[PDB]
Amino acid sequence: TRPRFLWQPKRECHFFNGTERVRFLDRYFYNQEESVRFDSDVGEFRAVTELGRPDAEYWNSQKDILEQARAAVDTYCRHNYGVVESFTVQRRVQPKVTVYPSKTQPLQHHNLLVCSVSGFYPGSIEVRWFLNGQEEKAGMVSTGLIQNGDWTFQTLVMLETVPRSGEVYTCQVEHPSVTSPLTVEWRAR
Amino acid sequence: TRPRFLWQPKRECHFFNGTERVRFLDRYFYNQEESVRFDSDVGEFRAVTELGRPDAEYWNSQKDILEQARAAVDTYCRHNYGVVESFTVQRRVQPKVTVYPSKTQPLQHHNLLVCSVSGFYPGSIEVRWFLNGQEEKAGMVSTGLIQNGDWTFQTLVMLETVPRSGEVYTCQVEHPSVTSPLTVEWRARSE
Amino acid sequence: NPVVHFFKNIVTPR
Amino acid sequence: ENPVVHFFKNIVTP
Amino acid sequence: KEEHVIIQAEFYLNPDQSGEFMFDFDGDEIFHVDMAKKETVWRLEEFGRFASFEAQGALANIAVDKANLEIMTKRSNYTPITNVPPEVTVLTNSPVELREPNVLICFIDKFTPPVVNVTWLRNGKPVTTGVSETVFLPREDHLFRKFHYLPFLPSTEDVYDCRVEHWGLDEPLLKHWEFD
Amino acid sequence: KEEHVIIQAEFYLNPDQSGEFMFDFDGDEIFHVDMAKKETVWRLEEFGRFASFEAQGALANIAVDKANLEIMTKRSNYTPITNVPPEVTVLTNSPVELREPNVLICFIDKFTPPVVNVTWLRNGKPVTTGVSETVFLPREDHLFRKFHYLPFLPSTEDVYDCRVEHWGLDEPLLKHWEFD
Ligand SMILES: *[C@@H]1O[C@H](CO)[C@@H](O)[C@H](O)[C@H]1NC(C)=O
Ligand SMILES: *[C@@H]1O[C@H](CO)[C@@H](O)[C@H](O)[C@H]1NC(C)=O
């Protein structure tokens, strides 16, 4: 099969402290090499690879293209954020916590306790494990944040334990969609 | 922690049809941006990023470096290939095959038959599955080639089945280190 | 409702 | 010495 | 550090002559324009009740891309892209409960170019019932991401496989899933 | 097509002041020069009985690297590298069988810069008995690879974890492994 050629223009707006600080970046990629870009923080186009020299030099010569780009932070980045802040920045969906050990083994052997946090949004979250009210800071294996692609996330955090009678374990989740942390326990059967 | 700065010079020799055709590439990477390089197929240095402009232009001025670089295809690439080909290109290690069912259940239920191939070299290999002497062409999930980092590879190929009494499954592996392919069977046994 | 603004593309002398 | 492996030698820019 | 990122990503690819236009927020797609139906498509229907976008702007922006690719191609001297194979992985939306509806997600990551064939397999047989997919989402490294969804009903009797085909792959890569 | 590739890769990293020199054949390391003991080290013993390399050339070439990095740094205006976190994964050498020796492999992939801390943990406790590792192998995308090995005796009473720490990681990453 014949070879392929890919052109990819990417404009990205980065926001800090709401919209008190914005940074615009006009990036252009040929195949897998970014060739030229404009960084609001710099004021003008720059060629990343020699391939973009012809454009960086030209676009830099024309005033209208430079003004268009310098105003982007306001007329484009800020406008757009206000147009979607309602269903994105402010979108909040509550996690769905479930606790369960993997492997149904008799008590006093090694085990792996699973804290399955699922269906939430935003992706910022904090899962912690506690044994009889005391926080376990070791033995945790996490899967990290997983993007389901439908505007929800999921994650699993496990703890290696050697369960003994009357031990009570607790998974505590923290998330902007909940005022006070969620908790769910598991008692050493 | 303070920031880091990385300089990475990479010289690669690419061989085709043995030594019938070679191509040298003198590459230079600053952090994660290749800055300048020499391609034997071009004959002279070129700057990939504006950062390499100074050297690419300079090195090209000294007709002594150009020589070193243009001749490297022989004085470097082909030389070395001869020095190592005996224990690399000619290297051969036999695979170790094992067949087993993941999930030890009662017969008649869906299962996964694993054929693990380990410790072989080179990487080229072909694994096939047979049920009662006929090759199965669907239901095979492979892990692909896994490089163990110690000059050997490994791979796993599973077959999706619903075993019944009297069925016999065979995993067959083809590899340059073996004249007649390897096969190991598994008689449908209820465990 | 409110509108999303797209960044207009321009060609490049060749 | 057994057969020897040739390395590409480096020198610098001012 | 930063709080949020909005990206307007697009692309054109030859010889395929296929392009794309989309907005992305913190990694998720807000919307993308359908080239063939020349209409903007929100990622969640609700979104459409809050904002709007003139599909024409995208179609126009794509033509300018087809033109600049043909220029950059020649200017590059016709060096093509080197295939980078995908990293498939099959997951489940919410935890699994037998006989209660769920959804199988097939995550195809870090690959290029944006051309891939994906087929859902149930017990070896293909499936189309309610399956859905997303357009090619971008990544920082100039590579791509994509998701395929297949709604299904958990049970002990079925097994599933996501079959991915990409030019950077030696042969079809299968990702298996089955209740345990 | 393309049959084989030999690569002479090296690098210097500041502030750490650490460098590396090695030869690579189709992905596997042929040898590397020990910067501290000033001696070439063959990946596999046998290799040494086939070829030879004068460790001095390497130490010289590294010196030049240190210099060029200090030039490129300044010339770069002092822009540093952006950390890229690894892709850890734990595996087993051959299939596992109770009471038959084996070896656990810890694949640390696609990361940069070339600095990483790895610890083997058995039942939560660190382990040093017979563990071994490799230098930093290079990868096409200018990133790095690395392997860590731990010989062990298969059993149902133990559990292992590979602990990896890298500047691109928000915190220690733990990869679990256990026979069942
Ligand atoms: C997808 O399948 C079609 C039909 O066989 C084929 O023409 C095309 O090459 C395939 N695409 C990939 C990426 O394999
Ligand atoms: C490696 O460990 C040392 C000692 O704990 C620590 O100073 C350093 O931050 C670690 N490196 C990384 C990348 O985590």
> Using CA atoms, how far apart are residues F173 and A95, in angstroms rounded to an integer?
23
R_g (Cα) of chain B, nearest Å: 25
List the structure tokens of E48. Answer: 């459409």
Of all helices (H) and strands (E), which one includes residue A126?
strand A126-131
Residue with tokens 């460790």: F55
Coarse DSSP helix, strand, coil percentages of chain B, rounded to the nearest 5 percent: 20, 45, 35
Question: Do E114 and E154 have their domain in common?
Answer: yes
List the structure tokens of B59. Answer: 């090195």
> Using CA atoms, how far apart are residues E40 and E50, in angstroms rounded to an integer?
14
> Using CA atoms, how far apart are residues F140 and A30, in angstroms rounded to an integer?
18
Choosing from E28, E60, E80, the residue where a domain stops is: E80
DSSP string, E88-117: EEEEESS---TTS-EEEEEEEEEEBSS--E
Question: Do F90 and F123 have their domain in common?
Answer: yes
Phi-psi region of B97 (alpha: psi -120 to 50; beta: other; left: phi over 0): beta
**Out of E30, E52, E75, closest to residue C3 by CB:** E52
Q: Is A69 helix (H, G, I), strand (E, B) or coil?
A: helix
Question: Do E62 and E34 have their domain in common?
Answer: yes
Give how far A147 is from chain B: nearest CA, Å.
Answer: 24
List the structure tokens of A5. Answer: 């050629």
Resolution of the experimental model, in Å, one decimal? 2.6
**Out of C2, C4, C6, closest to residue E61 by CB:** C6
Question: Do F72 and F157 have their domain in common?
Answer: no
**Sequence ranges of chain B with CATH classification 2.60.40.10:** 90-191
Residue with tokens 């050493």: A188
Choosing from F80, F99, F128, the residue where a domain stops is: F80
Neighbors of chain F with 3 or more C-beta pairs under 8 Å: A, B, D
Q: Is the CB of E145 under 6 A from ligand 1?
A: no
Residue with tokens 């190592």: B84
Using a CB-CB distance cutoff of 8 angstroms, which residues of chain A are in contact with residue E10? 8-10
Compute the Cα dihedral for A170, A174, A177, A178 and give only its sign.
positive
In the stretch 1-14 of chain C, residues with CB closer than 8 A to chain E read 1-4, 6-12, 14
Nearest CA in chain D to B24: D8
Angle, vertex CA A36, rays to CA A32 and CA A41, nearest 5: 120
Angle, vertex CA F85, rays to CA F83 and CA F89, nearest 5: 160
> Using CA atoms, how far apart are residues A52 and A27, in angstroms rounded to an integer?
11
Binding residue positions of B for a peptide antigen: 55, 59, 79-80, 91
Residue D11, Cβ density class (10 Å: 0-12 exposed, 13-18 middle, ≥19 buried): middle
CB B150 within 8 A of CB F43: yes
Cβ atoms within 10 Å of D2's Cβ, excluding its own: 12
Residue A182, Cβ density class (10 Å: 0-12 exposed, 13-18 middle, ≥19 buried): middle
B5-16 and A168-174: which strand pairing?
A: unpaired
Coarse DSSP helix, strand, coil percentages of chain F, rounded to the nearest 5 percent: 15, 45, 40
Protein residue with its CA nearest to atom 9 in ligand 2: F167
CA neighbor of B143 nearest in space, from B156, B153, B154, B130: B156
> Using CA atoms, how far apart are residues F88 and B181, in angstroms rounded to an integer?
34
Query: Which residues, 6+ apart, have CB-to-CB distance to A134 below 8 Å?
Result: none
Protein residue with its CA nearest to atom 4 in ligand 1: E117
Interface present between B and C (3 or more CB pairs within 8 Å): no
- Chains A–F, number of C-beta pairs less than 8 Å apart: 20
CA of E113 to the centre of ligand 1 (A): 13
Protein residue with its CA nearest to atom 6 in ligand 1: E117
Which atom of ligand 1 is closest in space to residue E167's alpha carbon? 13
Question: Do E108 and E126 have their domain in common?
Answer: yes
**Can the peptide bond before residue F15 be classed as cis, meaning omega within 30 degrees of 0?**
yes
Q: Give the phi and the psi of residue A79 in degrees, each rounded to 5.
A: -50, -60
Using a CB-CB distance cutoff of 8 angstroms, which residues of chain C are in contact with residue E77? none
Q: Is the CB of E165 under 6 A from ligand 1?
A: yes
Report CA dihedral (E138, E143, E144, E145) to the nearest 10 degrees: -90
CB B60 within 8 A of CB B45: yes
List the structure tokens of B131. Answer: 């049920």
Give how far E48 is from chain C: nearest CA, Å.
Answer: 9
Residue F117, Cβ density class (10 Å: 0-12 exposed, 13-18 middle, ≥19 buried): exposed
Compute the Cα dihedral for F35, F39, F45, F47 and give only its sign.
positive
List the structure tokens of E163. Answer: 């079959």
Cβ atoms within 10 Å of B175's Cβ, excluding its own: 22
> Using CA atoms, how far apart are residues C4 and E6, in angstroms rounded to an integer?
12
Angle, vertex CA B157, rays to CA B153 and CA B162, nearest 5: 160
Strand-pairing partners, residue B31, are: none
List the structure tokens of A36. Answer: 């030229």
Helix count (H) and strand count (E) of chain F?
2, 13
**Out of A11, A35, A149, closest to residue E105 by CB:** A149
> Using CA atoms, how far apart are residues A105 and F8, in angstroms rounded to an integer?
52
DSSP state for residue A53 in the 8-state scheme: H
F160-165 and E132-133: which strand pairing?
A: unpaired
CB B161 within 8 A of CB B113: yes
Angle, vertex CA F34, rays to CA F29 and CA F38, nearest 5: 140
Q: CATH number for the A90-189 domain, one of 1.10.10.10, 3.30.930.10, 3.40.640.10, 2.60.40.10?
A: 2.60.40.10
CA neighbor of A40 nearest in space, from A76, A72, A78: A72
Report CA dihedral (F175, A157, A165, F125) to the nearest 10 degrees: 30
Q: Which domain holds residue F14?
A: 2-80
> Using CA atoms, how far apart are residues E120 and E127, in angstroms rounded to an integer?
6
> Using CA atoms, how far apart are residues F13 and E100, in angstroms rounded to an integer?
54
Residue E58 CA to its chain's centroid (Å) = 18
Query: Which residues, 6+ apart, have CB-to-CB distance to A176 below 8 Å?
Result: A92, A122, A124
Choosing from F27, F51, F80, the residue where a domain stops is: F80
Q: Which fold has domain B90-191?
A: Immunoglobulin-like (2.60.40)
Amino acid, res. E108: I
Which atom of ligand 2 is closest in space to residue F166's alpha carbon? 13
Q: Is E41 helix (H, G, I), strand (E, B) or coil?
A: strand
In the stretch 137-176 of chain A, residues with CB closer than 8 A to chain E read 146-152, 154
HEC per residue, C1-14: CCECCCCCCCCCCC
Candidates B80, B81, B88: best to mutate against D (most CBs of D within 10 A) is B80
Give how far A141 is from chain B: nearest CA, Å.
Answer: 23
Neighbors of chain C with 3 or more C-beta pairs under 8 Å: A, E
> Using CA atoms, how far apart are residues A3 and E16, in angstroms rounded to an integer?
10
8 Å CB contact of B14 and F2: yes
- Where chain C is discontinuous (C–N > 2.5 Å), the residues before each break are none
CATH code, domain with F176? 2.60.40.10
Question: Do E151 and E96 have their domain in common?
Answer: yes
CB E127 within 8 A of CB A129: no
CA neighbor of A100 nearest in space, from A156, A165, A162: A156
Q: Is A75 helix (H, G, I), strand (E, B) or coil?
A: helix
Residue with tokens 């990939």: B48
Query: Which residues, 6+ apart, have CB-to-CB distance to F98 below 8 Å?
Result: F154, F155, F156, F179
List the structure tokens of F177. Answer: 């492994």
8 Å CB contact of B140 and E176: no
> Using CA atoms, how far apart are residues A27 and F66, in angstroms rounded to an integer?
32
Strand-pairing partners, residue F18, are: F13
Give how far E141 is from chain C: nearest CA, Å.
Answer: 22
Question: Do F103 and F144 have their domain in common?
Answer: yes
**Out of B7, B81, B96, closest to residue F11 by CB:** B7
Cβ atoms within 10 Å of D7's Cβ, excluding its own: 20
**Sequence ranges of chain B with CATH classification 3.10.320.10:** 1-89
DSSP string, F30-53: EEEEETTTTEEEESSHHHHTT-B-
Amino acid, res. A97: V
Nearest CA in chain E to A84: E51
Cβ atoms within 10 Å of F62's Cβ, excluding its own: 20
Amino acid, res. A107: L
> Using CA atoms, how far apart are residues E74 and A90, in angstroms rounded to an integer?
46
List the structure tokens of F105. Answer: 């492999």
The number of distinct structural domains making up chain F is 2
> Using CA atoms, how far apart are residues B45 and B49, in angstroms rounded to an integer?
12
CATH code, domain with F28? 3.10.320.10
Cβ atoms within 10 Å of A136's Cβ, excluding its own: 17
> Using CA atoms, how far apart are residues D5 and D11, in angstroms rounded to an integer?
19
CA neighbor of A176 nearest in space, from A117, A99, A90, A98: A90
CATH architecture of structural domain A1-89: Roll (3.10)
DSSP state for residue A78 in the 8-state scheme: I
Interface present between D and C (3 or more CB pairs within 8 Å): no
**Out of A112, A138, A142, closest to residue F124 by CB:** A138
Of all helices (H) and strands (E), which one includes residue F72?
helix F55-76
Residue A165, Cβ density class (10 Å: 0-12 exposed, 13-18 middle, ≥19 buried): exposed
Q: In whole angstroms, how far apart are CA D7 and each of D4, F7, F160? A: 10, 10, 41
Question: Do F104 and F180 have their domain in common?
Answer: yes
**Can the peptide bond before residue F113 be classed as cis, meaning omega within 30 degrees of 0?**
yes
CA neighbor of A51 nearest in space, from F158, B58, E68, E101: E68
Give how far A23 is from chain E: nearest CA, Å.
Answer: 10
Nearest CA in chain E to A115: E95
Which method was used? X-ray
CB E148 within 8 A of CB E131: yes
Question: Do E170 and E85 have their domain in common?
Answer: yes
- B33-39, strands of its sheet edge to edge: B45-47, B33-39, B21-30, B5-16, F4-14, F18-25, F28-34, F39-42
Question: Do E71 and E104 have their domain in common?
Answer: no
Question: Do F64 and F90 have their domain in common?
Answer: no
CB A120 within 8 A of CB A94: yes
List the structure tokens of F156. Answer: 């149902």
Residues with CB under 6 A from ligand 2: F 115, 117, 165-167
